[PDB]
Design a protein around this nucleic acid. Structure first.
Lengths: 118, 88, 94, 58, 116
RNA sequence: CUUGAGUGCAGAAGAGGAAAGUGGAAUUCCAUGUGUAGCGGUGAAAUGCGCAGAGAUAUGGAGGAACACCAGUGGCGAAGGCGACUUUCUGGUCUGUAACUGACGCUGAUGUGCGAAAGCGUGGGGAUCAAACAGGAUUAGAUACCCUGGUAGUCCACGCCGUAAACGAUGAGUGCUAAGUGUUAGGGGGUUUCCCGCCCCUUAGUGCUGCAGCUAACGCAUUAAGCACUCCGCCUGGGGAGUA
C-alpha cells in the first residue's frame, strides 16, 4: 500500500536554505510520499530563495499530498528560510488541517567549529 | 595539604609553650608537613605547575623562618634542624 | 569522613526477583569495603525526561554512605560499566 | 531562605526553567548570583540523571 | 549606486542578520519569527533591512518599538562578526511589497471574471 | 613592643591546577525504511555529487571534537590563560576574632621555572575546520577576495621551541589626599513579629562619573598618569638596523 497510503495525519517537512527551498510531505512516523523543490519547477538561483517560490512549491507538494489523501499535517521548520513565514498560510489555504506548528532549528551545543569565512 | 587533625597534633608536639600556636618551630614543622604532602602529590601528578608554585612559596617561607631562627637562637635551631632531618 | 549520596537507574525490563537481587547486591558491594550505608531508599517508578538508550523509564533509588574517599566510586566505576542492567548512576558529596 | 538547592527536588528546578527546558536568566527569575550558580549546578546534575529534559517541545 | 560588492555584502549581511535577530535578541518580550532582505548604498555606510512580522497592527508596532531599542546590540554583534570596515547605520522597515504584491494579484480576479 | 609579616580559631566564594570516569546536542560517515530527478553554491554562475537512487524524512550504529541555556561592564589565576557533570589529589585569596612568634620585612643583577598561537621530533588519533595544493568563478590582468574539495595541522602522550598589539601599550612594595553611583564575596548594627524584604556602617575585589593635583594635550584622578620613600629593568634624533 506504499504508493496509495490512506492517512489524513502526517507531518509537513519544509526546508528553506538562503538559496533553495525543499518541501516534502511525510506520514506521522515520517514516510515520504512526494516532495517539491524550487529546482524541480524551473526556479533557478535567486528566484529559488524568493518566498513565493517556496509558497508555490508548497502548493505543488500539497497537490500530490492529497492526491493519495491527506487532511491534517504538522509543520516542521528547519533552518533560516525566506519562504517559511507564508508557508503555513500556504498549506492551510491549500485545503489542509494543520494542527501543530513546530520550529526545529538544529542548534549544535558547540560541537564543531563553523566555517570561518562566508 | 594536611588534614586539620594532623596539623593540630604537629603543633601539639612541636610547641614551645602550652599556649603557643605560631612560632618558628611550629611553623617550620607544619610547613615541612605540607611540603611533603605537596611533594607526594607532584610525584603522582607531574604536570601540575600551579601547585608547584605554591610549593615553592612554602619552601621559601620555611627557609626564611629557618634563617630567622638560626640568626635568633642557634641552639634551638640546631636541635630543630635534625628533629625533621632537613638542611644538610 | 564524607557522605556520598549515590542514586542509580535500573531498567524496567528486569523481573522483581532480579531487581531485588540487584539492589541488595549493589548495597552490599558498596558497603563491603568499609563503607556503612546510612540510608538506602527506593524512590521507585518515575518517568524519565529522555529515553536513555531505548528504555522509556527506570527505577530511581538512593543510597547514602559515609566512608573514606575511595570506597564508593571504586567498584561502581567498573561494575556499573560492565553491568548492562544499570544505565545511569552518579555519586555526589555533602 | 532555602540556602541549599538539591537536584532531587524537581519542583524548584521546574519553577526556574524555560518552556524549552533551558535555564532562565537571572533577570527573568530575579534570584541572586550565588543561588543562580547553585541552581545551574543542580539543574545540570538533574539533567545528567534524565530527571530533566535537554530539549523539550512536545 | 549599486555594485556587485554591495550585493555580496547584502547577502552575507542578511544571513547573519536573520540569525542574530532570531537567536540572540532575547530581552524584547515580543520576539517574532521574521524573514528579511537587505540593501545598501554603494559606499556601505547605509543599509536598509526589509522584513515581515506576524500579528496585528499593535504587535508589529510593539516589535518595532523593541527593534528600535535592540539596534545597538545588533550593530555591535554585526561589527564583531563581519570584516567590513565601517558599520552602516540600520533602520528596519516593513516589506510592503508583500501586501502590494498580494494586492497586485487581486485584479487578476477582474480579468478572469469579465472573460468568463 | 605589636602596628608590618606570618601561624593559629570560626567562616566564604571561585571556568585556579592535574588525573580518571560519565552525559546531552551537533558533525561527518555507515546501514536500513519511504521516496523520485534533483542537491549544494553564488551577485549570477560554474566546478562536484545524483538513476548504481541522490538531496529530504525516520530509525539504528561508528568515531572525533567542543561543551548551546546558565553567561553577567561576572569569577579565578603571577602571567599565558581557565566555562558540560561526577569523583580523587592540590595551590592561592577574602572576611571576623585575635591569645600566638615578635620585624621574622620590601625589592631583586646573576640563576632556575612557567609561558597564547604557530612550528619541530617520536608515536597515536583524525568528526568539523583548513595553510599548501587541484579545479571552477571573477578580472584589462587575479597568481587573491567567492565557490567546490583537500594535505600538514587543529586533538592526545612525552620532549623541543621560548616568541605576540604577551596591552592597563601604565614594574613591584608601602603610606597620605574630596565626593557620587553600580556590582561580586563577606562581616556588623538598626528597623520590621520575622529579612525574603529595607536602611546604616565596614573589609577586599571589579565598573562608571568626577574635586584638588598632574599632563604638551588627549586624558588620569583612593584600581592616580596626584603627593612621597625603597629596589629593579630600560631610554638619549630619524634612517642604515634588529643589520654585520
Amino acid at each position: 500500500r506504499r504508493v496509495k497510503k490512506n492517512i489524513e495525519n502526517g507531518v509537513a517537512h519544509i526546508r528553506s536554505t538562503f538559496n533553495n527551498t525543499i518541501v516534502t510531505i511525510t506520514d506521522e512516523f515520517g514516510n515520504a510520499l512526494s516532495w517539491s523543490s524550487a529546482g524541480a519547477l524551473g526556479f533557478k538561483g535567486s528566484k529559488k530563495s524568493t518566498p513565493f517560490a517556496a509558497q508555490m512549491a508548497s502548493e505543488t507538494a500539497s497537490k500530490s499530498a492529497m492526491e493519495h489523501g491527506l487532511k491534517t499535517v504538522e509543520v516542521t521548520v528547519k533552518g533560516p528560510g525566506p519562504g517559511r513565514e507564508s508557508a503555513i498560510r500556504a498549506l492551510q489555504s491549500a485545503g489542509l488541517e494543520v494542527t501543530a506548528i513546530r520550529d526545529v532549528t538544529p542548534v549544535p551545543h558547540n560541537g564543531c567549529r563553523p566555517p570561518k569565512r562566508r | 595539604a594536611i588534614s586539620q587533625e594532623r596539623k593540630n597534633e604537629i603543633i601539639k608536639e612541636y610547641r614551645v609553650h602550652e599556649t603557643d600556636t605560631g612560632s618558628p618551630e611550629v611553623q617550620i614543622a607544619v610547613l615541612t608537613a605540607e611540603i611533603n604532602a605537596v611533594n607526594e602529590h607532584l610525584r603522582t601528578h607531574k604536570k601540575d605547575h600551579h601547585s608547584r608554585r605554591g610549593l615553592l612559596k612554602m619552601v621559601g617561607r620555611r627557609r626564611h623562618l629557618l634563617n630567622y631562627l638560626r640568626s635568633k637562637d642557634i641552639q634551638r635551631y640546631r636541635e630543630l634542624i635534625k628533629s625533621l632531618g632537613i638542611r644538610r | 569522613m564524607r557522605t556520598y549520596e549515590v542514586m542509580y537507574i535500573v531498567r524496567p525490563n528486569i523481573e522483581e526477583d532480579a531487581k531485588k537481587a540487584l539492589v541488595e547486591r549493589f548495597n552490599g558491594i558498596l558497603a563491603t569495603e568499609g563503607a556503612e550505608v546510612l540510608e538506602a531508599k527506593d524512590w521507585g517508578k518515575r518517568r524519565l525526561a529522555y529515553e536513555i538508550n531505548d528504555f522509556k523509564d527506570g527505577f530511581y533509588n538512593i543510597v547514602r554512605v559515609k566512608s573514606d574517599n575511595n570506597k564508593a566510586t571504586d567498584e561502581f566505576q567498573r561494575l556499573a560499566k560492565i553491568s548492562d542492567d544499570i544505565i545511569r548512576y552518579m555519586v555526589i558529596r555533602e | 531562605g532555602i540556602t541549599h538547592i538539591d537536584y532531587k527536588d524537581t519542583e524548584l528546578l521546574k519553577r526556574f526553567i524555560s518552556e524549552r527546558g533551558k535555564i532562565l536568566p537571572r533577570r527573568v527569575t530575579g534570584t541572586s548570583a550565588k543561588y543562580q550558580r547553585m541552581l545551574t549546578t543542580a539543574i545540570k546534575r538533574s539533567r545528567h540523571m534524565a530527571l530533566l529534559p535537554y530539549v523539550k517541545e512536545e | 549606486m549599486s555594485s556587485m560588492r554591495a550585493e555580496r555584502v547584502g547577502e552575507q549581511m542578511k544571513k547573519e542578520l536573520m540569525d542574530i535577530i532570531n537567536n540572540k535578541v532575547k530581552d524584547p518580550r515580543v520576539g517574532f519569527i521574521t524573514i528579511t532582505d537587505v540593501v545598501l548604498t554603494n559606499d556601505l555606510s547605509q543599509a536598509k533591512v526589509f522584513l515581515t512580522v506576524l500579528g496585528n497592527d499593535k504587535e508589529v508596532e510593539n516589535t518595532f518599538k523593541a527593534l528600535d531599542k535592540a539596534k545597538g546590540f545588533i550593530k555591535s554583534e554585526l561589527g564583531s562578526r563581519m570584516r567590513l570596515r565601517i558599520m552602516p547605520e540600520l533602520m528596519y522597515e516593513y516589506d510592503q511589497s508583500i501586501e502590494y504584491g498580494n494586492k497586485i494579484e487581486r485584479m487578476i480576479q477582474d480579468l478572469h471574471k469579465q472573460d468568463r
